[PDB]
Amino acid sequence: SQKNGIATLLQAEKEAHEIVSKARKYRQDKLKQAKTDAAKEIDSYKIQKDKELKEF
Amino acid sequence: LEQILWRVLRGNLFFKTVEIEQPVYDVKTREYKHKNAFIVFSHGDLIIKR
Numbered sequence: 001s002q003k004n005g006i007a008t009l010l011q012a013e014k015e016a017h018e019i020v021s022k023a024r025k026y027r028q029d030k031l032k033q034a035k036t037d038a039a040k041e042i043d044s045y046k047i048q049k050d051k052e053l054k055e056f
Numbered sequence: 057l058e059q060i061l062w063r064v065l066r067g068n069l070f071f072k073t074v075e076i077e078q079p080v081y082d083v084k085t086r087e088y089k090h091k092n093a094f095i096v097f098s099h100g101d102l103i104i105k106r
Contacts, residue, residue, distance in 0.1 A: 006070050010097050 057094065064106070069098040 061069060072095035079088035098104065 003070065003072060007072055007095075007097055010070060014099075 061096070065098065065103060067098075069096060071096055 058071060058073075061071070072093060074093035074095070076091040076093070079090050081088040
């Protein structure tokens with residue numbers, strides 16, 4: 001059972017490493033989301049300028 | 057094969073030897089010899105290729 005359990009544990013460690021890689025990919029997606037949030041923050045000033053342009 | 061593996065791949069690499077019930081004929085050897093499974097698992101693509 002030691003060798004078979006070791007092989008199963010190696011497969012499980014591979015799965016955990018894949019999960020860590022997926023978490024890194026999700027972190028990249030969150031970075032893209034932060035970029036989109038910064039875009040929304042810029043668009044707030046864009047709307048402010050459009051109001052000011054319409055203010056004139 | 058196991059000794060060569062533990063020497064060249066000095067790191068830890070598990071093995072899953074399993075015995076074959078009946079011999080299987082070989083092409084060059086022209087004979088049937090008792091065989092065993094060579095299942096092995098390790099990390100690293102270069103290690104797998106080696």
